Amino acid sequence: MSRVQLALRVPDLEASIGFYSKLFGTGPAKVRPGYANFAIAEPPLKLVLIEGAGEDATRLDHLGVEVEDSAQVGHAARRLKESGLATVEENDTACCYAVQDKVWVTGPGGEPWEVYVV
Length: 118
Ligand SMILES: [Cl-]
Ligand code: NI
What we know:
Elements: E1 3-10, H1 13-24, E2 30-32, E3 35-40, E4 45-51, E5 59-66, H2 70-83, E6 88-90, E7 101-106, E8 112-117
Parallel strand pairs: 1-4, 5-8
Antiparallel strand pairs: 1-5, 2-3, 3-4, 6-7, 7-8
Bound molecules: chloride ion and nickel (II) ion (NI).
PDB class: lyase
Keywords: Arsenic, lyase
Assembly: monomeric
């Protein structure tokens, strides 16, 4: 029961929050200065909105896969590693007054993915 995380850097956080609330029929789960996120049940999605500074267009910030528990992150980190991808693991972190275990991989064209648990 994992779900994709889509993180967008948006030029207008307030406008984006309103648009996404309408699109998914649900308000944001978390709102902070320059930051919001939506936990969408259907489609299963963690949508993250980060306000850009003086930006003109929405762009991809990063992608991810949100899993249930640390064991799944661990399983993923091992699996990705064995597949031959370069991974960077984080454990028991800090950011967003929250705690996360995660593993980062980067695609060929530079798009970064985190497999993580909140
Ligand atoms: Cl995955
Ligand atoms: Ni993220």
